[PDB]
Ligand binder design. Structure first.
Ligand code: HEM
Ligand code: HEM
Lengths: 787, 781
């Protein structure tokens, strides 16, 4: 038969199944398909050829095509996935037909492997999903200029599916508005133009409103240089204009640099304004976490809404935030979603970087633009550094009182003018170790490492006196007042210190101000007791209840007495004995040093006079003016008044200075001490001064004595070099005819040392502890010459 | 057999042709296809079925297949347009197979009604056509994140294509720079996002080019809601990032709110970066007419120049300025040019709006501000002070600015000010005028002090200004202005003029404005170099001054003073060139040389007359430094035959116990070597006296300042008496310098000064004739 060779040598797999669905034939094309050999399946049910997972459903097809023939249909051709003997489920073209071989109900199947063309179709699928995700809408036309094929982009842009857009004139599909009439003519011209061209038209949507499109026709020829295809493409000009203006406006608002959440708010406002029927909410990255940053007030739920993602990223690296927008389907094309998303995302990156930059700028702004004092950030840094150093500072909060009333009356033009000299006065009395800051408004924070109560009271008093002179503006007095809250405790944090200071400040201010106060006692009792001491001391000086002690000093080699040096002393009926080392600083603090000096010199004169009444007794008497902080305003009158009201021959009494008060500074005490010298008072010192100028000054008004200090004498045994220093000092003494005194001598050993070093007088316990004022006439004649 | 119905009754169109191309079989499906009858087609030429327009060549194709073999291809399949008997033409798929009967050559053609094939071929066309028409790269990724799709846009913009890129991960396919901003991780995860996402990358072409791209990935799920593919679009954001950089940077500028002109210049520079080899001009509407705002520093001629212009308008649409660009033809695309133009337009409009919208202390570092500087200079002018003004501009800041923005340009300036403060002297008024410019006002005017200050300030910034491990090297331009009687504004203007000159010339340097003193400093540097050469060729000398006891008139010792003579400059005294030595940094060498020569001449004098008692070198007047005492005394004494105990040295108390004190132990070891000392003041109280008597000084040198005026000032007469007495009390020798007259000599012999020196006995004598004087007139009793 002619059919035998044609059927045998064929490239399409042919199979036949009987009415019972059993196979009886195979060909090399079928063997290339599936993989089974002919003999493996000849005369067997089709089931094994059927896919293993499809066999359960195949009997349904068998019944449908055998009991009713699928409503009397012989067969058909379509695509099907074939499982090759290797197990691969390849795609192929199958065909079925009904055949009456042997007069029975047989079925003939044809198969052709279609893997390559299936792959081509898959490539089509990928590119079409891309075309859907292909920003600007595009459509294709045959030379007859009828839309043959389109995309999801054009479908979104003009509400026309491919089923609606197949094979018709582009305008007929896109019913254009009649006004103006030239729209149709121009679009037909561009439609049948064979060269690439672009123009502007005024199309009308499926659903309504006019739009102005920028239509673009372009050609594509073939190998034979004939029109093969055309592309008509466009996306927009109207919403593109909208978004260009949107970006302009959002840039303008962002340039206005509004706060972080307000920036989010403006972004939301504009994004809603354009893509209405949508919700917007941005997340900022803080501590690496997504925090709700902004959200539009239009949070009403909208049916059929799709979320759309975007990542706000800074100049480099990980995300800085998450942008996401939910939009109602059909509001605008997916391409326009992508477009607005890009602009919003990058604009948000700019906004967040702006926020971070302003954060850093504010952090680095730790100073003041008006006064110039370091500001609260610097103060916190400084206190934290002090705590780390483990040094306990004392924080003073100084608050101005009258400045608010000044603002209320005359205004800031006077308030700031007052604060200028307020801070100037602060800085004038500032000290090298101190640290000043301006936390806020009319409040200041002063910091010092001094922890003594006696020093704290002094610093507070200086600060309080800063306003001792009322502020003068245009000859108008302004008596401002200061409320001072101090705090100092061990182990507390800067936060506690500041809070406590502020509370103390408010308490004292509301109490009346013009004053200072410690933390709540705490040590306010330690201050009350010291105030008690001060009041008692003032009363004591007024009543003249003090005691003056006396201390002989004797020549080292003769044993004869050279003189006596006096020392102030105070015995209290209540508190008992209190030393100068404590009540002289207290005298300075309570402003009684002038008085104590007066009294000590007076009593010295009393004793000298009464003793001369008896006999020559005292050759010379010494009183330590330096140890009593004797100021410039005291010397001439305070000495001469007594020296003359009673009878003292000048050379009888002597005074002592520490050479620091002697350096010129601004007192020029030189003249006062010269007057004392003229009266005949001996001059005693402890050092020679800065250099040649110092020595020349010392010799110019020739001083009489030079007093080696106990600090040197006691450590003489420790250090031989100090012995050399003393040798030099005594040698200079002999050179200039200066009497060299030594203080704090204690034992026979130091006495022998000074003997060999030619000290020429000794004062200290080793010969007599300072004996009370009345034993002197007995001790002198009963112990001298203490040879 | 079933072989017959399998074809005869088959609904699949199949035809057979023999060696003569005669149709031997024609199925009813073939009848349905063509329109012929089986009895009419059987035994006839295949051409009858072949389309008439194609029939003539069909026999030729059959003959070629029969004769040439064509590699014995078994079969093939493709589509073609069929022509029916009635004349109607239709499109049909088909396939050919080679069959043989009776040992001859036969051909079998099978036909399919191409409906899905036709539609899908039409589509494939339309789709490739559409994508190609558009010029946006796009690719597709399988679930394994492997590219399985490309387009002409992707291949042209990336070089790669499916032929090479098929089935390979995007990161590997996409070369990237060496972690410039750690974008490797960005690419890696973006290629792993499980939802539609988008960011930006830098990728390098096959040639390698840092081009910027906007990756937007979008997932597409199958019908059953499973991730099927990931379609990604690379938008060419080279231009778009130009837009970005433009805004971002100028927005940052706007936030920093610089001067109007500075904003304009920022715009100029970055727009120029955007448009290569272009020119930019900016005008603004002032007083109702366009007046210059700014312009690009570039002003050279442009070949094939193209001019574009735009009117900057406010929100209301009214004009606000005129921007213009000149670009070289072919350098930039028109689309790019227009985009940069309009973005610049609107952004700069916002900048102008910010300008329209827009206290005696710097709120950032802590220096005064221009108002305070003006007040300070005014308060100096009213007192008639002629302040020397150093206007310091910190150059290379632009790298800091572009790297970390104005917020950190502030940090850089903070570091600059912090480094400057540590050296700022008292009586020096440092303020910050604006941005990157500081004003240091000083009172001292002597040119030597001015130059020293300038050098110190330039040096203190020697070390890089490190910020967050990014040591930006910043440089200093120091304009100097100074002129008697000139006001604050002129001083500032001229200082800025000199600063502008040195900045444009390169910076990292300092410059006077006034040319007279500008050449004066040049001559001063000439003198410095001359002395530098002179010391190196060691042409110097040392004049001596014998000094004698006041009792026997016998020689006590000889001083050694430096000297330098040049044929060009003539005599240049030490009093003048020693500070020049300080400036040039050769004081150490001068000290070395004076020491060496004193020792050598001592040895030479030993070789004939060893009687030379002692030699004294005035280190205090020579500005000796801390670390040179021990070495360059010991070296000289050992090298020469001098005994060390023969020469002494002189040092003042300030240098004795200030500027640290390791100098103290160095003088300890010097005394250990045994060199006698000679002190000036032994000041600073009892501690000073302790040092004095602990390090045997062996002599005290009363200077001319005191020796003179002795007959007049009673206070200094008393000082002299006291100090002579102190020396006599110790075992110290007292020296009186600069005695000039017989009455002064008589007074000094009264106060018992031991050794006298000065012109009253001997003007200094050169290296020779010292022996003549010493041997002729020694006992000048
Ligand atoms: C890889 C092997 C096979 C697969 C994947 C497969 C799959 C299918 C499926 C899913 C259907 C339902 C309708 C359609 O998709 O066309 C069908 C229909 C059918 N199948 Fe199969 N089948 C295979 C093998 C066969 C063979 C070789 C025959 C031989 C007769 C057969 C007999 C039938 C019949 C008679 C129908 C009725 C279809 C109609 O009348 O339109 N099956 N097949
Ligand atoms: C509408 C009907 C047909 C058309 C338009 C057509 C067209 C062509 C053309 C143009 C070629 C040249 C090779 C090529 O273009 O790839 C060709 C090849 C060939 N055709 Fe056809 N043909 C038709 C029907 C048939 C039929 C029914 C047969 C029966 C055997 C046949 C046998 C052949 C053979 C043997 C070749 C040689 C292939 C080769 O050498 O590569 N043609 N055909």
């Amino acid at each position: 038969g002619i059919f035998f060779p044609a059927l045998e040598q064929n490239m399409m797999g042919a199979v036949l199944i009987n009415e019972n669905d059993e196979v009886m034939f195979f060909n090399p094309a079928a063997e290339k398909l599936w993989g089974y050999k002919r003999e493996e399946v000849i005369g067997n049910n089709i089931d094994m050829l059927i896919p293993r997972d499809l066999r359960p459903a195949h009997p349904e097809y068998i019944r449908h095509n055998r009991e009713g023939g699928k409503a009397r249909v012989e067969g058909m051709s379509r695509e099907l996935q074939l499982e090759k003997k290797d197990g691969s489920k390849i795609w192929t073209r199958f065909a079925l037909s009904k055949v009456s071989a042997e007069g029975k109900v047989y079925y003939l199947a044809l198969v052709r492997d279609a893997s390559v063309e299936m792959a081509q179709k898959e490539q089509t699928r990928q590119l079409i999903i891309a075309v859907d995700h292909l920003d600007r809408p595009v459509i294709v036309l045959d030379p007859e200029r009828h839309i043959v094929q389109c995309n999801r982009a054009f479908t979104e842009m003009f509400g026309y599916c491919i089923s609606e857009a197949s094979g018709m004139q582009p305008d007929t599909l896109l019913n254009t508005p009649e006004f103006p009439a030239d729209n149709r003519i121009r679009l037909q011209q561009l439609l049948w133009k064979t060269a690439r061209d672009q123009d502007e038209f005024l199309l009308l949507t499926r659903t309504g409103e006019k739009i102005w499109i920028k239509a673009s026709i372009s050609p594509v020829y073939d190998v034979l240089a004939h029109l093969q295809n055309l592309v008509m493409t466009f996306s927009d000009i109207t919403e593109e204009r909208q978004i260009r203006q949107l970006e302009g406006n959002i840039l303008a608002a962002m340039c206005s640099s509004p706060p972080f959440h307000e920036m989010g708010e403006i972004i939301c406002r504009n994004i809603e304004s354009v893509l209405n029927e949508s919700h917007v909410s941005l997340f900022a990255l803080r501590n690496g976490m997504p925090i709700h940053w902004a959200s539009s007030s239009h949070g009403a739920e909208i049916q059929n809404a799709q979320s759309w993602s975007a990542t706000i990223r800074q100049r480099d690296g990980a995300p800085a935030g998450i942008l996401q927008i939910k939009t109602s389907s059909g509001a605008e094309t997916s391409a326009f979603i992508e477009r607005v998303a890009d602009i919003s995302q990058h604009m948000a990156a700019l906004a967040l970087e702006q926020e971070k930059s302003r954060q850093h700028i504010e952090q680095l702004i730790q100073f003041d633009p008006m006064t110039g004092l370091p500001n609260r950030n610097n103060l916190h840094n400084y206190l934290d550094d002090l705590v780390d150093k483990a040094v306990s500072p004392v924080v003073y909060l100084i608050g101005v009182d009258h400045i608010q009333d000044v603002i209320d009356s005359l205004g800031y033009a006077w308030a700031d003018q007052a604060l200028l000299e307020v801070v100037n006065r602060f800085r004038e009395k500032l000290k090298p170790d101190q640290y000043l800051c301006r936390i806020e408004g009319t409040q200041f924070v002063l910091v010092s490492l001094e922890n003594d109560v006696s020093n704290i009271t002094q610093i507070a008093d200086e600060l309080r006196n800063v306003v001792s002179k009322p502020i003068m503006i245009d000859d108008k007095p302004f008596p401002l007042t200061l409320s001072i809250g101090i705090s100092y405790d061990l182990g507390k944090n800067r936060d506690y210190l500041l809070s406590t200071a502020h509370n103390a400040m408010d308490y004292i201010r509301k109490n009346g101000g013009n004053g200072w106060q410690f933390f709540s006692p705490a040590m306010n009792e330690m201050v009350k007791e010291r105030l008690v001491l001060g009041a008692a001391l003032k009363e004591a000086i007024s009543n003249n209840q003090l005691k003056l002690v006396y201390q002989p000093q004797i020549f080292a080699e003769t044993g004869e007495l050279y003189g006596i040096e006096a020392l102030a002393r105070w015995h209290d009926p209540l508190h008992g004995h209190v030393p100068p080392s404590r009540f002289i600083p207290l005298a300075e603090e309570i402003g009684e040093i002038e008085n104590i000096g007066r009294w000590v010199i007076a009593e010295a004169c009393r004793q000298l006079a009464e003793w001369r009444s008896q006999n020559i007794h005292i050759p010379a008497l010494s009183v330590n003016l330096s140890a009593l902080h004797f100021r410039s305003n005291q010397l001439p009158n305070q000495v001469s008044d007594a020296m003359h009201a009673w009878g003292i021959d000048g050379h009888q009494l002597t005074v002592e200075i520490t050479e620091s008060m002697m350096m010129e500074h601004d007192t020029e005490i030189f003249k006062r001490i010269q007057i004392l010298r003229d009266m005949g008072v001996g001059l005693s010192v402890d050092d020679f001064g800065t250099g040649f100028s110092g020595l020349s000054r010392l010799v110019s008004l020739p001083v009489t004595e030079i007093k080696i200090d106990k600090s040197f004498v006691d450590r003489c045994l420790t250090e031989k070099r100090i012995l050399a220093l003393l040798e030099a000092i005594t040698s200079i003494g002999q050179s200039l005819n200066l009497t060299v005194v030594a203080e704090g001598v204690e034992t026979k050993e130091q006495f022998e040392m000074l003997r060999k070093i030619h000290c020429r007088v000794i004062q200290g316990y080793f010969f007599s502890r300072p004996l009370p004022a009345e034993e002197i006439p007995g001790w002198m004649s009963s112990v001298l010459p203490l040879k």
